[PDB]
Amino acid sequence: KGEELFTGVVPILVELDGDVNGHKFSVRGEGEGDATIGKLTLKFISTTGKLPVPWPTLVTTLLQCFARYPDHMKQHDFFKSAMPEGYVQERCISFKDDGKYKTRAVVKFEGDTLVNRIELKGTDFKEDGNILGHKLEYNFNSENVYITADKQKNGIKANFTVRHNVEDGSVQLADHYQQNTPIGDGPVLLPDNHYLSDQTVLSKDPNEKRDHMVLLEFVTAAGIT
């Protein structure tokens, strides 16, 4: 029945308030989600000017409820089962040989709009590292998000590592530890182990004067037969 909220195109609003090593920034995003084909289209604007961190490092933070779950694993879709009341999504993102992001997001409906409101705190970053030094290429390498149930705590956990291309040819690892917990009290679907296959593409809007990121995502659940 949370499923029923995603049978069509859903408008999306994203708000991120960030602080990395004391550098404050704000991001606003809007777009739409179409879970029938696992498709997300989003455009994000910096409302505080040039970001202190590379746009690619924020992609995972900025709506896995829009993943396409094949009919045969629809009883494993925690994200939609927590709707409309929503879920809290928390991560620690550990950048190898560098600092960490800690994020807490509330994802829930407000009327017909799905709203993702995020707080991000970054600490322990090197002033001349790949992140604060803006050494990461504007691109993305997609792979699988591995999901497991956390029954004790009535939610899920996810783990994955993002490989960020560095301008000098090296790779900057970002170790993601993720937890999701429902906001409502009613029962939710808790999954068997599976994964989300991601396809992520970053672009620019040639008509946009503000610092910004255009994001296109295709997400499909897999791994259960």
The tokens describing 36, both together, are 């029938």
The residue count of the chain comes to 225
Q: What is the 3-state secondary structure (H, E, C) of the chain?
A: CCHHHHCCEEEEEEEEEEEECCEEEEEEEEEEEECCCCEEEEEEEECCCCCCCCHHHHCCCCCHHHCECCHHHHHHCHHHHCCCCCEEEEEEEEECCCCEEEEEEEEEEECCEEEEEEEEEEECCCCCCCCCCCCECCCCCCCEEEEEEEHHHCEEEEEEEEEEEECCCCEEEEEEEEEEEECCCCCCCCCCCEEEEEEEEEECCCCCCCCEEEEEEEEEEECCC
Whole-number Å distance between alpha carbons of 56 and 69: 26
Domain-by-domain residue ranges, the chain? Answer: 3-222
| Cβ proximity of 212 and 205 under 8 Å | yes
For this PDB entry, the determination method is: X-ray
The tokens describing 147, both together, are 């999901």
Say if strands 9-20 and 113-123 run parallel, antiparallel, or are unpaired: parallel
Domain at 3-222, CATH homologous superfamily: Green fluorescent protein (2.40.155.10)
Specified resolution (Å): 1.9
179 contact partners, CB below 8 Å, separation of at least 6: 89, 90, 91, 150, 153, 155, 156, 157, 158
- Among residues 18, 28, 20, which one has the least CA distance to residue 116? 28
